[PDB]
Amino acid sequence: MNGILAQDSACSQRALQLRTYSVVPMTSRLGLIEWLENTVTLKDLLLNTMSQEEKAAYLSDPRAPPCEYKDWLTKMSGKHDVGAYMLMYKGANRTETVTSFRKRESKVPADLLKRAFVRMSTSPEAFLALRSHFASSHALICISHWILGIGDRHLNNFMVAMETGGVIGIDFGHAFGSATQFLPVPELMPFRLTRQFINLMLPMKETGLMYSIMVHALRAFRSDPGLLTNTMDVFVKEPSFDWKNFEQKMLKKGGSWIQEINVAEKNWYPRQKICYAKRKLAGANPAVITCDELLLGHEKAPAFRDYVAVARGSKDHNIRAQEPESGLSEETQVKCLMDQATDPNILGRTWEGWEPWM
Numbered sequence: 483m484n485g486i487l488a489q490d491s492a493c494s495q496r497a498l499q500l501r502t503y504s505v506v507p508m509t510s511r512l513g514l515i516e517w518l519e520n521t522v523t524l525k526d527l528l529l530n531t532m533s534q535e536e537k538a539a540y541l542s543d544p545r546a547p548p549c550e551y552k553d554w555l556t557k558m559s560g561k562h563d564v565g566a567y568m569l570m571y572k573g574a575n576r577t578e579t580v581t582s583f584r585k586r587e588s589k590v591p592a593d594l595l596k597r598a599f600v601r602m603s604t605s606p607e608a609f610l611a612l613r614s615h616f617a618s619s620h621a622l623i624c625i626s627h628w629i630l631g632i633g634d635r636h637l638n639n640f641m642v643a644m645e646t647g648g649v650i651g652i653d654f655g656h657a658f659g660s661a662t663q664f665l666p667v668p669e670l671m672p673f674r675l676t677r678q679f680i681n682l683m684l685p686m687k688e689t690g691l692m693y694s695i696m697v698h699a700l701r702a703f704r705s706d707p708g709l710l711t712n713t714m715d716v717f718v719k720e721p722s723f724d725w726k727n728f729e730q731k732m733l734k735k736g737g738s739w740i741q742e743i744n745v746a747e748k749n750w751y752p753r754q755k756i757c758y759a760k761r762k763l764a765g766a767n768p769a770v771i772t773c774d775e776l777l778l779g780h781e782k783a784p785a786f787r788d789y790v791a792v793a794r795g796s797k798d799h800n801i802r803a804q805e806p807e808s809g810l811s812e813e814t815q816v817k818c819l820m821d822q823a824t825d826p827n828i829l830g831r832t833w834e835g836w837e838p839w840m
C-alpha cells in the first residue's frame with residue numbers, strides 16, 4: 483500500500499504513509515514484534531489526561547458510560563450477558579438508544595484528547611503541527627482498514643507517538659470483516675471515528691482535512707486495483723489462514739465471543755472475502771458490503787433483519803441509503819463511510835468493550 487501511495491502524485495505531495503514495524507514469527511508459537519520509542523496506547527493517553535475526580539468517577543460510577551450502558555442494555559433486554567446485545571437489537575428502536583446514548587456521551591469529558599495535546603506541546607506550532615499530523619494519520623489508517631476490513635479497532639489497538647503525532651495500528655487479529663462476521667455481537671463500523679476525534683477538530687468538522695485525505699487515498703488505491711487485489715487474493719488463499727487457525731485465536735478475547743459453544747466449522751468462505759474487497763475497490767456502497775457480511779455470518783440469528791436495518795440506515799437521517807449500491811465515486815464512498823462510522827444508531831448498539839462513547 484505504501485508503494486502505491488508513494489506512486490500516487492496527489493498523495494506524494496502530502497507525503498502520506500502508514501508506519502509498519504517489522505514482524506517475525508520464528509515459530510508457529512513464537513515471534514518478535516519490533517518495538518517503538520515514546521509510544522502509548524490511545525487509552526493510556528486519554529486516561530493519563532483525566533483529573534482525579536474525572537478518572538475516579540469514570541472507573542465505576544453507576545452513571546458513568548461503562549455502568550450506564552450495561553444498565554441500559556440490561557433494562558432494554560432483561561438479561562445480563564452477550565444475549566443482551568442480541569435482544570436489544572430486537573428491543574430498542576432508534577429513540578430508545580439515541581436518548582440514553584446522548585445522555586451517556588454527555589458524561590465523557592469533551593476536550594480530553596485536545597487537553598492532552600495542549601499539555602504535551604510547547605507552543606501553538608507544537609499544537610497545530612501535532613493536530614495536523616495526527617489527523618492525517620488517523621484518516622489514512624481508517625480508510626486503509628476499511629479496505630482490508632479490519633474490525634477490532636478499540637482504543638487499545640491505536641498507539642500514538644510523542645516524537646510526532648502519527649497514530650499507529652496494531653493487533654490485526656481480524657482481517658477481511660472477521661469481527662463483523664463471526665463474533666456474537668457484530669461490530670458494524672468501517673473503522674473508529676468516535677466523538678473525541680471530531681471534538682479535536684471541534685470548530686472545523688471532518689469535511690476538511692480528514693475527508694480530503696480519505697478521498698485522496700481511496701482514489702490513489704482505486705487507480706490500480708490489480709496489484710493490491712492480487713496481493714489480497716494471495717493473502718486469503720494461504721493454507722494457514724483457514725478456520726482452524728482463526729477460531730483458536732477467537733478463544734482469546736476475554737469472554738466477548740461465543741464462549742465454548744457453536745464453532746459451526748463449515749463457516750469459512752475465502753472467495754467471498756476477495757470478492758467483497760474487489761467490490762469495495764470498484765465503488766460499492768459500504769452499507770451493502772456490511773449487509774452482505776451480516777448475511778454471510780448471522781443468517782439464522784433472530785436479529786438478522788434488525789442487524790441489516792441498522793447497518794443499512796434510513797433515508798431520513800443517514801446518507802448511505804440515499805445512494806445506489808454500486809458505481810459510487812470516491813467522494814460518495816467516503817461520505818457514506820463517515821456517515822456509517824458516526825451514526826449514533828450504530829454506536830448505541832456497539833459492544834461495550836469497543837467504547838463507542840469515547
Ligand SMILES: Nc1ncnc2c1ncn2[C@@H]1O[C@H](COP(=O)(O)OP(=O)(O)OP(=O)(O)O)[C@@H](O)[C@H]1O
Nearest residue numbers: 503515516517518519521522523638639641652653
Ligand atoms: N509494537 C509495539 N510497540 C510498542 N508497544 C506495543 C507494541 N505492541 C503492543 N504494545 C504494547 O503492549 C500492549 C500489549 O500488547 P498486545 O498487542 O499483545 O496486547 P493485546 O493482547 O492486544 O491487549 P489489549 O487488546 O488489551 O490491548 C499494548 O497495549 C501496547 O501498550
Ligand SMILES: [Mg+2]
Nearest residue numbers: 638639652653
Ligand atoms: Mg489489542
